[PDB]
C-alpha cells in the first residue's frame, strides 16, 4: 500500500512531510496524465462536400474554410487547401489531418483536419499592436504561452528527429481551446528527417554534423522578436534590446539572445528554452534569489520549499473544481501541471542561471 | 503569500494551513451539491400520478408517484397509517393534506398524506431483515455499512439535539434508506409522532426535558445489536451480551453499545461522542499507529497531529485527482470522510482512541 | 400452497379440471376487485373561480358547467348549480362530490364534482330515435348495459336502505369513461332513509310495511319502455308489448312485465332485475335451453360447463391484454367480469325462468 | 364455438385447447415486446460521446455512450483487443470502422471498435467471481440463476446449430450479462472469433463439421462447473468429480454436467435435451409427482398431460391478473417459462424425467 510508508515514519513530522512531498509529485505527474487524454480527444476515426462560407485562416502552407460532414450536420471540420505530413505520434501542438485527396483549381491538394484554426500567429501579432502598447504585461505573458507551446511541439519533433526548417508566424495555427489559443505547428513543406541506399562518401567532418541540431531553436529566437512588435535583426551578444515593457521584458530579451547565440555549441536547446519560460510564466523570481543566501547549496532548499508549496497550491486548485460548477480545466492549467510535475531544484537552478538571476 | 520558504518549519505550517483550508472549502461544497421554493396542499393532488408500495414504514406506507408540474424528478407519498431546520439525515416534506384512500392499497378510509422527494426503497428493519445471509457470508463489508448507517444516524441526532428534540421511537423500522449519488444509501430518520422538544397547565417535572437527556443514547445502543442481527439485550461495564467477533468493526461496535446501554445518564456517552467512535472505527487512526512506543501521550498527540495532515493530504490529493476526469462524481462516502478530516483534532481523536480502549 | 391440492389429484382428469375450474372463479373475483380500483380513482382530496364556457348538461336537479382550478389548469370539475348527499359509500353508479356552498343568483346551492357528465339519459334516449330504428341489436345491446348500472347502482342505494324514488331519465347522467359511458344515479331530492324520537304511534300493520321495499323497482320498469322510445304505460300481466326489434326486445319486455307488477310481494327486486340483464348481455340463451335435456338436474351440469367456457375464455381475454398495446380494460369488461365471477348454475337457471326460456 | 357444452369431456378438451392457443400467442407477444433501422460507420462517430468501461470482455473493452440523433437511448461502444439471424441471446451490432484509441483506456493504438445498443454490464466471468459468497450463502438462490444464465445459454446454442455456427470458445468471460425488464440478466453470447460454418482448396476432412458436431455441449458441461464455482474437470458416467450437493437443483445440475461430459458424441446429449432437462429443473414436474404409484409409464404420460394442462391455466391466470394491474410488465423469467410450458409435451417431458434419473 501507499500509506505503509507514512504511517512508519508518521512519528516523525520531518518524515511525513518528506512522503507527502514526494507523492504530491506522483500525483502531478498522473494529473500531467489524465489532463492529456482530455485535451487530447478520445477515440480519433480516419475518413460528398461539407462547406460553409469564406476563408477561416491564411496560412503559409495553405488556406482554411470551414466544412460540414453529412451524417452529422453539427461536427465542425477545416479543409486546408494547398498552395506532406510528419512521420510522428500525435502532438497537442503538431498538425494532424483525417486524410487528403486531389479536387479541382477554383479560383489542389485537400486535407482535412478537426482542428480548425481562426488565425495564425501572424495574424495575431499583427492585430494586437494597439493592446501591447496598452496593456503589455497581459500581452508579453500570453507570449510566453504561445512561445511554451511551440517549444512543447519543437520538443516532439526533436525526440523523433525531424527539423521543422520553416518557423514563421505565418505556419503557427491558433484554435480555441481572447481565451489562451492552442498553437499548432504546420506547414512541413520543407522539414527534414535524420536518417537512422543513397551515398555515404560523405566527409567524416559532414557525417559528425547533422548540423541541424540546433536549427529550430535559432529560428524560434527571431520569432520572440516577432512576437514583441519588433524586427528580425538579422535582415547573449550584443544584438538590439527588448523595450522593458512588463515583467517578461528583460527574460525574454536574455532567451533571444541565447537562442540567437551564432556559435551553435553554444546556443541553448529548445529544451532549455522551454524550462526559462516555465520559469518566467510560474516563477521562481528575483525576490527568491535576492534573499541572503550563502551557498547554492542552501538556495536548493528554499527552491525545494518553494516546489513544495507550489504543488499543493496547484493541488489544492484541482482539488476545488472537483466539486463545484463546471469541468473548468483550462490549457493554462494544464501547462502549469507540466511544469509543477517535472520541476526540481537541479533544473530550476540551471533556468535561474540562464536567466541571469543566479 | 511565500515569505517564508526559507525555513522548512514555516513550510510544514503554511501546507498544513492549505490542508485544512480547503477541506473547509470542501464539506461546504459537498454540503450544496447533497441538499440541491415548491409546495403542494389537496388541490394540488390533481398533479400527480402513482406509479406501481416501494416502502413499509413504522409510521405509513409510502409510493413512487410523479407531477406533471416538475416532471423527470420523482416523489414519495407517504400515507400515514393511523392510531427544525433541515437535515440531510431527517425526513422533509413538500405538503400534506388528508385524502380518502383505498383499503386495496395499505372501500376508503380517511388518512393523511405527505408528499416528499427523498423517495426510500427500504426501512432499515427491511434492510437488516434481508441481510442476514450477506453478514455471515461478508461481515467486513456487512459490518462497515452498518457503521456507516449508524454514522448518519448520529448526524441527525445531534442536529434534533442542537433543536431541543428527542426523538423516543428510534426503531430500525423509523429509519429509512433512500438512494443517493449527485453504493451506500441515505438514512433518513422519521416518524417524530412520539417525540419531545424544550397551554402551560403541566408541571414542572414534565415540560422540562430533564430525565430523557439520554434516550436517545441508549435506543441507539439497542439499535447496534439489531443492526448486527443480535436481540435487544433486554429481553463499559459488561454483563451486557458481547457481540460474537465477525470482523474488525466487531470489537469496536460492541465496546461503543455497551457505553451507548450504561445505566446511569451520568457515565452514558453523549451522541457525539459516539459520532467520533464510529468515524475513528470506519477511518482510524488504528492500533497500528497507537501502540507504537511513544515516552508519553503528548507525543502521541504530536503523532496524531501529523496523521491529521497525512489523511488530509491524501484527501485533497482524491479530490484533485477527481477534478480531471469525464466523471466528476463526489459519493456520500467521501463527504462524510471529509467532514471527519476537517472536524478531527488530536486530543479529540485521543478521547475517542481510549474509548474504544485502543489506550 | 395454491398448488398442493392440484398435485395431490393431479393423476385425475376429472380431478384437476374441477379444481382449475373452482380457482378460475377465485381468479375472476380478484379480477372484479382490481377492475374497481382501477375505475374508482385512486386517492381522492375534498377541497376561487373556474370556469370555461357554456352549458354541459341538464338535469332535473341542476345544471352542469365544466370547470378548471387553477393550481392545475388542467383538472377539470363539474360544477353543479342546483335547482343533499345520501349518506352511503362511494359507488361507481351513484353521484359523489367534493365539497359545495352557496354563490349568488346569476342568470343558489353550488356543488362540486370530478365525473362531469355530457348528457342524461333523457338526452340520450331524446337524440337517438333515428339509430334505433337503423340499427336496434346495437342500441337495445346499450340499453341493458345502461340497465344494468342502473341495478348496480340501485342495488347498492338498498343495501344501505336509500329509497331513491325520483327515477327518471332526467337524473340519470352518462359521463364518458358512443363508447358505453358510464350511468351515474342523481338527483337525491326525495331519497327516504329506513330508520334503523318521533313517534311509533303508527298502526302494527304499518311498522311491518316499509312498503318502499320494491318501490325502485317499479320505477325502472317504466324506464325500460322509456329508454325504448315508447310511452309510459301508467299515464307480467297484460301490457303493452314492445316491438321485437333485435335480440333483446322480448326479454327487455317481460322484464318489464316482472317489474311493473302490480302486486308488491310478486314484482321482483332490483338483484333480480340485474341477473336478467346480466343474462340478457351475455347469455345464456334459447339454444342451450332447447337442445334436448331430460330435467332440471342435467341442464344444471350443462350450465356448469357454460360458465367454466365462458370464464377461461374471459381469463384468455385478459391475459392478452397484459401483454399487448395499452391497457385496454373497457367499462364492458368489468361488467362482464362481475358476471361470470357472481354466477352459478343454481342463479342461471332462476333468470332463464324469469325470462321464460326455462 | 360451444356445441359441445353438454359434454364434460368434449369441455375439457376445449379448455385444453384455450390453454394451448393462448399460451401460444403469448410467447409470439413476448417475442415482439423483448427484441424491441438505424446503422453507423466511421463517420458517424462524430455522433457519441462516452460517458465514464462498464465490461471487460474475452475480446473487448465496452464503454457506454450516447448519441445525440438517438438520444435517452444508451449505447455501449465495444473496443476490440487485439491478436446468422438476430436471437435475443447472441451478441448483434450496429456499425463497426477503426479507430485509434489512447492506450489510456484499455499513445494511441489502431483497434476495430464496434457499437451496440445491448450494454453488457458484467461478464458471466465477473459475475462467477464475485458470487463465491452468495453462493454457500444462498445456494438455491445463486444455483437457481445458474440454471437460468444456463437455459438462455441453450437458447443462444440451438441458434447457432439451426444456422451451421459452432463458437468454440464458450468461457465465462464470453457470455455478457445485461439488465433488461420490457432481477435476472440477458445472457448474450459473443465473441465469435474462433468459429466455424457449414476458396475451397481445402481437404474435406476440415470443410465439413464432423467432428465438432458436439463440442458446444462439451464446453457447456465444463460451464456448469466453473458457475458452480468448481474447477474445470480436466486439471452419465461418473469418474467425473461430483458437485457438493447443497439445493436442490446441485443433484440435477451434477447430472447434467455428466451428459454434456460424455467421452464420444453419440452418447453426449444434444443442447436441445440439455435445454429441456434445465426447463424441468426450474419449473418441474419433480419428484413428487413421478414416484406416485402408476401401474404404467403411459397412465404417467397421461397425469403429466394433465399437468401441462395445469402449469398453462396458472400461467393463463397469472398475465390476467397482471392485466388489470397499473404496472403491466414482463418478466424475463415468465417469458422463458412461457416458452416452457407452450412447446411441453409429456412424451418430451418423460425423457427429461429420466435423464434427471427421476425415474
Redesign the interface.
Same mark, same amino acid.
Do not use: H
Given at each position: 500500500l501507499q500509506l505503509h510508508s507514512?504511517?512508519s515514519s508518521?512519528?516523525? +513530522? %520531518?518524515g511525513?512531510?518528506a512522503k507527502?512531498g514526494g507523492?504530491?509529485t506522483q500525483?502531478l505527474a498522473?494529473?500531467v496524465?489524465?489532463? %492529456?487524454? #482530455?485535451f487530447?480527444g478520445?477515440?480519433?476515426?480516419? #475518413?460528398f462536400k461539407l462547406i460553409c462560407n469564406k476563408p477561416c485562416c491564411d496560412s503559409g502552407d495553405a488556406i482554411y474554410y470551414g466544412a460540414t460532414?453529412s +451524417?452529422?450536420p453539427?461536427?465542425i471540420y477545416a479543409v486546408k487547401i494547398c498552395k506532406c505530413s510528419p512521420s510522428v505520434?500525435?502532438h497537442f501542438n503538431i498538425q494532424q489531418d483525417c486524410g487528403h485527396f486531389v479536387a479541382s483549381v477554383p479560383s489542389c491538394v485537400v486535407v482535412i483536419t478537426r482542428e480548425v484554426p481562426h488565425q495564425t500567429a501572424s495574424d495575431f501579432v499583427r492585430d494586437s499592436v494597439a493592446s501591447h502598447r496598452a496593456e503589455p504585461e497581459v500581452y508579453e505573458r500570453r507570449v510566453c504561452f504561445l512561445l511554451l507551446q511551440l517549444c512543447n511541439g519543437l520538443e516532439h519533433l526533436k525526440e523523433h528527429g525531424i527539423i521543422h526548417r520553416d518557423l514563421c508566424l505565418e505556419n503557427l495555427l491558433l484554435v480555441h481551446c481572447k481565451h489562451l489559443p492552442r498553437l499548432i505547428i504546420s506547414n512541413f513543406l520543407k522539414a527534414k528527417q535524420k536518417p537512422g541506399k543513397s551515398q555515404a562518401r560523405l566527409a567524416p567532418e559532414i557525417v559528425s554534423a547533422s548540423q541541424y541540431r540546433k536549427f529550430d531553436e535559432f529560428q524560434t529566437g527571431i520569432l520572440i522578436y516577432e512576437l514583441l512588435h519588433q524586427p528580425n535583426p538579422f535582415e547573449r551578444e550584443d544584438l538590439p534590446p527588448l523595450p522593458t515593457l512588463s515583467l517578461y521584458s528583460p527574460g525574454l530579451q536574455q532567451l533571444a539572445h541565447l537562442l540567437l547565440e551564432a556559435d551553435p555549441i553554444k546556443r541553448i536547446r529548445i529544451g532549455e528554452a522551454k524550462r526559462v519560460l516555465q520559469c518566467l510564466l510560474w516563477g521562481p523570481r528575483r525576490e #527568491?534569489v535576492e534573499?541572503p543566501?550563502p551557498s547554492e547549496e542552501v538556495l536548493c /532548499?528554499?527552491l525545494h /520549499?518553494?516546489i513544495?508549496?507550489k504543488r499543493?497550491?496547484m493541488?489544492?486548485?484541482?482539488? %476545488? +473544481?472537483?466539486? %463545484?460548477r463546471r469541468?473548468?480545466?483550462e490549457l493554462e492549467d494544464w501547462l502549469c501541471c507540466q511544469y509543477l510535475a517535472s520541476a526540481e531544484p537541479g533544473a530550476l537552478l540551471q533556468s535561474l542561471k540562464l536567466l541571469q538571476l543566479l
Open positions: 507514512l504511517l508518521i512519528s516523525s +513530522k %520531518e511525513t512531510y507527502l507523492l504530491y500525483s498522473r494529473l496524465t489524465k489532463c %492529456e487524454d #482530455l487530447m478520445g477515440l480519433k476515426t480516419e #475518413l460532414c +451524417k452529422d453539427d461536427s505520434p500525435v #527568491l534573499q543566501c /532548499n528554499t /520549499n518553494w513544495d508549496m499543493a497550491l493541488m489544492m486548485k484541482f482539488a %476545488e +473544481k472537483a466539486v %463545484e469541468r473548468g480545466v
